[PDB]
Amino acid sequence: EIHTFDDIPMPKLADPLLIYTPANEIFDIASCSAKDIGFAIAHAQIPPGGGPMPHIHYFINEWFWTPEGGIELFHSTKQYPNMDELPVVGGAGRGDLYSIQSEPKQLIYSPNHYMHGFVNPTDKTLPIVFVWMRNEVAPDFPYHDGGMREYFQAVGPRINLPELTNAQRAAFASEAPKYGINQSSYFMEYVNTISDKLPAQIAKLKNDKDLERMVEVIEAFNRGDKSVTCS
Amino acid sequence: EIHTFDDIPMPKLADPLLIYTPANEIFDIASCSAKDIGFAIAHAQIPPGGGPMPHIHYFINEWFWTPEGGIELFHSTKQYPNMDELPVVGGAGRGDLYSIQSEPKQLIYSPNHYMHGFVNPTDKTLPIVFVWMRNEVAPDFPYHDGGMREYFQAVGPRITDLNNLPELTNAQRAAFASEAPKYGINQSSYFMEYVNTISDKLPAQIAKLKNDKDLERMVEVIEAFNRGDKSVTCS
Numbered sequence: 049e050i051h052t053f054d055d056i057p058m059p060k061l062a063d064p065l066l067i068y069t070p071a072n073e074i075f076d077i078a079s080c081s082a083k084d085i086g087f088a089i090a091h092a093q094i095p096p097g098g099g100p101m102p103h104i105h106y107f108i109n110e111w112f113w114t115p116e117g118g119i120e121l122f123h124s125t126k127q128y129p130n131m132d133e134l135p136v137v138g139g140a141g142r143g144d145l146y147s148i149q150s151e152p153k154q155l156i157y158s159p160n161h162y163m164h165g166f167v168n169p170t171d172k173t174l175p176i177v178f179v180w181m182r183n184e185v186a187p188d189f190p191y192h193d194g195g196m197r198e199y200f201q202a203v204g205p206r207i208n209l210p211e212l213t214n215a216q217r218a219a220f221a222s223e224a225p226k227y228g229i230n231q232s233s234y235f236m237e238y239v240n241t242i243s244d245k246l247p248a249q250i251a252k253l254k255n256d257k258d259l260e261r262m263v264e265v266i267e268a269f270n271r272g273d274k275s276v277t278c279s
Numbered sequence: 280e281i282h283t284f285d286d287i288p289m290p291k292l293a294d295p296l297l298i299y300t301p302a303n304e305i306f307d308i309a310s311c312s313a314k315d316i317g318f319a320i321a322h323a324q325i326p327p328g329g330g331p332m333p334h335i336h337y338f339i340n341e342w343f344w345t346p347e348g349g350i351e352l353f354h355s356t357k358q359y360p361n362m363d364e365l366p367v368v369g370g371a372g373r374g375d376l377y378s379i380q381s382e383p384k385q386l387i388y389s390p391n392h393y394m395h396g397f398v399n400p401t402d403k404t405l406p407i408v409f410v411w412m413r414n415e416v417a418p419d420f421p422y423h424d425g426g427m428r429e430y431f432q433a434v435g436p437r438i439t440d441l442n443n444l445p446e447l448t449n450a451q452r453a454a455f456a457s458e459a460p461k462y463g464i465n466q467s468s469y470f471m472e473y474v475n476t477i478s479d480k481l482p483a484q485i486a487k488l489k490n491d492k493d494l495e496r497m498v499e500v501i502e503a504f505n506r507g508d509k510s511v512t513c514s
């Protein structure tokens with residue numbers, strides 16, 4: 049009933065890019081591209097209470113992979129195809145979210161336009177892997193990846209951990225639309241309710257085909273295949 | 280039911296205490312007491328997205344008064360009598376909260392031990408009044424108010440210039456949670472820490488809670504202080 053995945057490997061860069069995101073996530077992140085495909089991927093460590101506020105993507109489709117479970121995710125059934133329409137009380141209207149208590153090696157797929165987010169509600173640091181695949185409408189970015197690696201590089205300090213400033217926290221939200229994200233700045237901004245009863249509409253979301261294409265790209269880079277680029 | 284109240288005046292101090300709380304609230308706060316009663320009161324301005332993460336009181340009973348509505352409050356049906364038992368995963372467990380879309384001049388009573396919080400989810404600053412009354416088990420504090428004013432004064436920077444509000448630091452935000460048990464509060468450090476679900480259907484158990492008698496008493500105290508009745512003290 050619950051979907052799992054054995055492994056999502058990390059593309060191994062000569063000099064790994066390490067970022068501490070303003071949502072308190074320890075990121076090891078890369079961008080890869082090849083014929084007709086572009087994506088960013090992060091292997092992350094999430095401290096007690098770390099995680100992004102609810103947000104919606106316009107340039108990417110996203111996979112979450114929780115090697116140890118424990119991470120609580122949030123997801124809508126409502127889709128928001130219009131980036132110019134924010135889901136706030138002062139207009140388009142806040143949404144309803146459903147929580148997911150992740151299990152070891154669970155794979156959660158979240159297409160563009162869905163509202164999602166996650167938190168570590170435990171007292172220990174937990175691993176998570178994110179894969180952000182460029183969709184068909186994404187503009188080009190320097191790494192051709194849909195824009196997510198450029199986003200985290202732009203608003204998050206390079207990695208004993210550096211310390212987050214108010215400007216960095218406020219920019220995590222204000223800079224987000226340049227990278228095809230509507231990012232709330234506080235938890236209840238885009239949110240009316242949170243429910244622990246998971247709708248079938250959410251539970252059945254799945255796209256193994258593209259993830260496996262991206263895995264082959266990563267493994268190809270790791271084997272030294274010059275026809276792909278990770279960077 | 281919607282309980283409402285006409286006015287909760289502010290004790291007018293010679294030297295008003297103005298604090299910018301680590302929860303992005305602009306406070307005008309005072310402590311008062313008389314022979315029979317003790318409390319703190321804040322008239323506050325809550326910017327967009329302002330308001331404290333869910334928390335539980337042990338030294339006070341709380342009233343919220345929303346002169347213009349707009350503020351969204353959260354409240355449990357479950358009480359948490361044991362300060363040493365945290366409502367977290369792996370602990371005594373996160374709780375179910377229910378939201379209240381406040382009406383103009385709505386009065387919300389929240390006894391000690393319930394979980395509550397609020398946020399301004401609008402794009403404009405909104406007013407709110409808090410009254411925090413010293414309950415029967417509260418320790419002695421320098422202001423004999425049950426601890427809330429001492430809490431805010433300890434964790435929040437003084438506002439010296441309304442045009443240049445203080446820049447809150449990481450340490451101050453962390454202290455806002457860490458210092459809280461000293462003042463009889465279990466204060467979460469992020470929204471989902473104490474929270475299992477948020478539901479918009481408000482149970483009639485929560486809706487029923489009220490205590491006009493005690494609010495009326497404190498109102499008199501404030502009004503007598505503002506009249507220079509030396510039988511009471513606000514400071």
Ligand SMILES: [Zn+2]
Binds near residue numbers: 105110164
């Ligand atoms: Zn996302």
Ligand SMILES: [Zn+2]
Binds near residue numbers: 191192
């Ligand atoms: Zn290029």
Ligand SMILES: [Zn+2]
Binds near residue numbers: 334341395
């Ligand atoms: Zn309170």
